[PDB]
Amino acid sequence: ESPTSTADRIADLAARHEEAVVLAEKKAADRQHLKGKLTARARIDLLLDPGSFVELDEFVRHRTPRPYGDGVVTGHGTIDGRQVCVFSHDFTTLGGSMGEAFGSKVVKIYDFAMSVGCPVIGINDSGGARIQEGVMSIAYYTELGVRNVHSSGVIPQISLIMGPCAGGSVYSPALTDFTVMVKDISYMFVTGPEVVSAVMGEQVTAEQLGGPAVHAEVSGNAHYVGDDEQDAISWVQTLLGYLPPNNLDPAPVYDHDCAPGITEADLALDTVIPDSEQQVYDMADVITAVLDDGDYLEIHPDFARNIICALGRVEGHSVAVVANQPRHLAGVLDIDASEKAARFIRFCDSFNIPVLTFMDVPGYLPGVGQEHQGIIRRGIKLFYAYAESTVPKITVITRKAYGGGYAVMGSRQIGADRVMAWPTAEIAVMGANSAVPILVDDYRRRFGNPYEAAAHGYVDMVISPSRTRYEVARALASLRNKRQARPARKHGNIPL
Amino acid sequence: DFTTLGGSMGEAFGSKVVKIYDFAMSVGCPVIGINDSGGARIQEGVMSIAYYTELGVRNVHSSGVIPQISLIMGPCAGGSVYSPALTDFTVMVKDISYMFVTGPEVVSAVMGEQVTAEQLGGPAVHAEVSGNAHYVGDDEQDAISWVQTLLGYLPPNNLDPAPVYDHDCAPGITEADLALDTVIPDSEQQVYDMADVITAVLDDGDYLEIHPDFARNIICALGRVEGHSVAVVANQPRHLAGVLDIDASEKAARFIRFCDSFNIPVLTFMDVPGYLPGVGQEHQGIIRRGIKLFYAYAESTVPKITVITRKAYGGGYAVMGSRQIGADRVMAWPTAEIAVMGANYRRRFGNPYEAAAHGYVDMVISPSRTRYEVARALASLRNKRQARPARKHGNIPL
Amino acid sequence: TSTADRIADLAARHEEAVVLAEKKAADRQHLKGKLTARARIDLLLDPGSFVELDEFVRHRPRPYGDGVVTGHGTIDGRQVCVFSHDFTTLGGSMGEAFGSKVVKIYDFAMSVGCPVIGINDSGGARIQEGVMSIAYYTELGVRNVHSSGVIPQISLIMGPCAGGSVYSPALTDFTVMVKDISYMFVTGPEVVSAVMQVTAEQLGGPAVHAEVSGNAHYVGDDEQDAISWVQTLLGYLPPNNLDPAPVYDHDCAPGITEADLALDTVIPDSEQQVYDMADVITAVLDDGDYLEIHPDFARNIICALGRVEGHSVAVVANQPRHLAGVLDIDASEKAARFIRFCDSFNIPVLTFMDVPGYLPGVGQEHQGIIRRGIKLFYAYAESTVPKITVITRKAYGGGYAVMGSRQIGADRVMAWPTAEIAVMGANSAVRRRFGNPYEAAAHGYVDMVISPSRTRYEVARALASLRNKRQARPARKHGNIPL
């Protein structure tokens, strides 16, 4: 019911707003704080620019307790001045459970984001499906999932996991481009610990089964884990600072403080590669020499540490970095590193971010484990990602460049636009220990260098390492107007 | 030709394969590669790698453009695996073929593992464990025959139509159809063979099965209805109660995306209780890998018909070609149980009628009618046109 | 339970949903001289071709189907989608379940590109559902707008159709009502009389919309005739705006016939004597037959679909038997929308012209003959389908400009020796020297001057010569036609 008078309806609206927000927030704060968690609205407030939030569907209700908003807070705002859409589950209101009203609110802000081409950040903290709504619940899960698939590579999609996330709740995060978890308040699994322990013979805790560390290091479902909710939200904002709003519009360009000439940071790369091939180096020291301010945002820091995927800038422009890391498993490629880099590269290609590869790859990790778990069809994903991509590709060969690993890591035949090799680059069909299908020191002298590849034009230049920053910046600037045609098809058939 | 220079990859060799692949892309016809190689020609150094890469690149730019089929009829190691891995179907032959990125010499010298080539990457390994092999022939005649039969279902390319064959379906109800009224057991812990339903519906009771020895809890096959190519994805309760898991999800997911690329409609037979639980499945990444099948269904635009024979719980029901994921026609049997969960109640909710009340299902039929209604739906959907997101490509989880 | 028991349980609800519901519905509808929703679906579609969807959908008394029968089928072998309100169940009123069923049939028809036939017989909005009903009305309306010119849309009005119920029929391409059993109005006679005293038939009965308002393109004597009318109409149309129209075999005489020669005498000698333009049209079309649109509305103009050599042809022709064939508001809007529809579905336009000018008067000017008569000019100029024009007699000023003259875009314009193509008539220019087509012919504004007996023969040839016509269109979301 409503009042009749105009002033009384304005007052009545103020009362319902008071109940739906101010009251609902006080009380949610009490229940969440005793579990070390923030409220849906506190997270929205930390994520968005102050004063930018426009809340939608504040007075939506389900159709049979009927709290305003139905357990999710939705709307849009800005992050560092650029528009974004937002939803944030309220775990304290009907469990943040997936219902038709809840789901319709999330569907609307997703439709809006697709309509204007802006990113979507989902803040997840849910008790799961709303069982009393029966199959209706499933329908809306599927609706949201379908939008994720139709937004994939169109608008950036980021998932923050800041509470329970089980069952159908895992479906939308799984389809977004980045999933960010938080240290002690989040977990993630399709099937829960109690039923795993009831049908399978396994007694496991929620954190052992699908805690943050599991997905950051073992399954690879988590691209970053924040120490606290603030650290995760900050990571998300920093990531958005590298991305375009959509796959058509340009990425942001920032002012820079790049040295035009040789610096001591540049001269340090002349000694970064050890004399002995037993000794490794930290690729990060190479990467930081090239990127603006020596800084980058690392994707999957704790997953497949034998390869680095990161976003940085050169002369104020977004650049994606993929680099073999000799500090872990000698920088060989394997299943985890290949899927890690493969999806990173395909994402950057969709949103027109050029890829800067630093190569030092001795080969693949050999064992029964790798073959039986499918290194062929899963390692080939990185080949597919490189060959499919049309963004500018610049490749710096620092050391090992053996066989298929060399082929995959942004070689010129796979589509790289500029390939430079240091004199430490060893570009060969295989190492000298493997080439005894026909003394290994002699082979090492003839072929442990880039000059056969350079002689065939497979690399474009062989430079002193200190020139790297400079040449990368040149190559990048020369490639910004690149246009490359794509095969005509509904889509490819990438191995899965 | 393995007997000539080891059948090894070089610039001349490689340029010959480059020329035939360029031709096939040029006229839009399928490519069948027959592999039997000692590997890279090391005397040619990086040249060999370059050409491997060239062929790989062509495979990627042909993916979803022309059907690509790889027969592995011998050794296939190192660089040799790259092109087969990128084609759409890999067919091996027992006793004579194997595939691995790194060979046993290096596995033992680097990892301390003593394994033979056949244990490391033999046909059984790739047909049953890794999934790299979509079919393994007993002999070469059987593998070649399999490849030709497969081609008989497929269009030459992603624009031209698939072949249509002469037909012999009985116009009215048969006893094979009426047999489906009895296939679902009364007792719910008792299973049935989903293959009997599939063979009841398809022409000649026949289908060419993809990945027969891999993830047998799901069936992927090509068959025909009234002479037209139809792709079948079906839960098989004979293995793991028809549960979904990592292997089944990736198997069906790629099958569906390939069929979508070449305009083959997808007919789903649903009977899924849920997902396989365990530390194994979660830590091996069931979230991001199981979701691949959801991506495949939701992305696809070919006609999709779904027959719900029995269990239809939660996310399993969502993924298996529900209407909300994009299916154009969804019919349910009276044995269909469409609910959020099973018993985590059974009398009021163990049936298709709440989903039917919401229009989430289009149809509740006696099973003997399935073949007929499926045929009608398929024929009614051949002119389907559906728009696709504008993008270079999506960002499917890998 | 048991598997056999669930099959039997399903048989019980199926009989409950259709057979028992059908006999009660048939009773309550026969009590008003109307057939059932399912009976009409069965008269419309090919026997046994109907596939019903959403048979057990229920709202949130809960009857199966929620008061509308939805599905798809074939008409004379070609696929069509159909919905049919059941007035006896919950008033055949618009609710969310009801609405979702028609939305699904509409989505399907848009998806496969086949026509939609809606059969309307509704108590209006389901008030108990509040705004939900409006929401769903709107959904359906939007789909009509996005189907407009994409798939043929036909509305059968076979009972009450008031309030929100009028919105979707108004947006379809053809609305057909039935004598004595149907009516249409935005607001009902109750409130209309409460600000004025009127009955439903005088406010919005079929005769009103067939002759006065123009909302009804045809009125059937009974339901069977209206349905037959719709099937005959679909036999002329493509399934959608991309795929070709049906082509039938014919037995056209290859040479000049006596039927052809009868037109040499059809135009009277003295210019105050009028003729029946229909005799010319029937001389040109296959079997002397055509399907007339808006037969009782603006009868100074004829709009019809016929065939030449088995191919669909649209005919727009001035009719001197009514208002001497002048153009007016009603005739302009009728012909204009017919032409735009035919252009959307790639049906060529055959014009027969005998136009002395416009109907004069305060009535016509004050009600906007400028902005509404100009719609027909827009329709001709916008259209890109082949346009063939036969000028039988009067060809005066803007009237001649509008009916498919060559400068407005016609591809072939032939004139009889009785054609008087002039800037204005004899009385207004202050004529024996100008009462003829030859200054127009001398300028090439007409392409040929023929003896009337040649008409059919040249028309057919022109038609056959133009099937591969392509014409570029302005780059725009859409135009700004006057409304």
Numbering used by the authors:
A (entry chain A): 12 to 75, 81 to 454, 475 to 532
B (entry chain D): 106 to 449, 479 to 532
C (entry chain F): 15 to 74, 81 to 216, 219 to 452, 480 to 532
How does the study describe this entry?
Similar to other bacterial YCC β-subunits, MccB has 3–2 symmetry and is composed of three individual dimers that form a ring-like hexamer. Taken together, these results establish the existence of a unique YCC-dependent pathway for unusual polyketide extender unit biosynthesis.
The active site of MccB is located at the dimerization interface for two opposing monomers where residues 137–237 from the N-terminus of monomer B are packed against residues 392–492 from the C-terminus of the next proximal monomer F. The individual monomers themselves superimpose well with a backbone Cα RMSD of 0.167 Å. Overall, MccB has a high degree of structural similarity to the previously solved β-subunit of propionyl-CoA carboxylase PccB from Streptomyces coelicolor21, with a Cα backbone RMSD of 0.738 Å. The greatest structural deviations of MccB from previously solved structures occur near residues 33–46 and 452–477. Residues 33–46 of MccB form a long α-helix resulting in a larger cavity near the substrate binding zone. Residues 452–477 of MccB could not be modelled in the apo structure, highlighting this region's high degree of flexibility. In contrast, the region corresponding to residues 452–477 for PccB adopts a partially ordered helix–loop–helix motif.
